[PDB]
Amino acid sequence: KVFGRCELAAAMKRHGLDNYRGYSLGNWVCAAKFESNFNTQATNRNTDGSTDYGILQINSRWWCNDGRTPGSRNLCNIPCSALLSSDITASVNCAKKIVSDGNGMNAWVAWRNRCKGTDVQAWIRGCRL
């Protein structure tokens, strides 16, 4: 599924991401834009051989099981394929554990490089929330 901007904003809000760990909804929509372009089926291979899955590009190195990332963990206790679903529940549940891990949204390097400190409120501008 390719979400619309306000569509994803509404789905993240319903799943309790708005201001989760103090991160306004626009931070989460910004991160999704640059991680996945709002495509739930997005997958990208890392140099270390781990893969990033779904709207928030959650890494098989720690958070999900894909069966092909040696010495990795599955801290969200999910198959990585669950992060590609048109239903974002699994991605949002796992993102709550990642952002709780001590470094907030800096875990998403594209958030740090492209969203952090910017006018993230613009990402939810005009959305009926």
- In the complex, which residue's CB is closest to Na ion? 72
101 is in an annotated binding site: yes
How far are the Cα atoms of 26, 92, 124 from residue 79, in angstroms, in the given order?
28, 14, 30
Residue 22 or 70 having the CB closest to Na ion:
70
CB 64 within 8 A of CB 74: yes
Return the residues of window 69-108 that contact Na ion according to CB under 5 A.
69, 72, 74
Residues 53-72, one symbol each (x = binds Na ion by CB under 5 A, - = not), give -------x----x---x--x
User: Residue holding tokens 């739930």?
Assistant: 40
Residue 74 or 93 having the CB closest to Na ion:
74
CB of 68 to Na ion, least distance (A): 9
* The two structure tokens encoding residue 17: 């991401």
Burial class (CB in 10 A: 0-12, 13-18, 19+), 4: exposed
How many angstroms separate the CA atoms of 59 and 50, rounded? 7
Residue 83 or 120 having the CB closest to Na ion:
83
- Binding site for substrate, by residue number, is 101
Residue ranges binding Na ion (CB under 5 A): 60, 65, 69, 72, 74
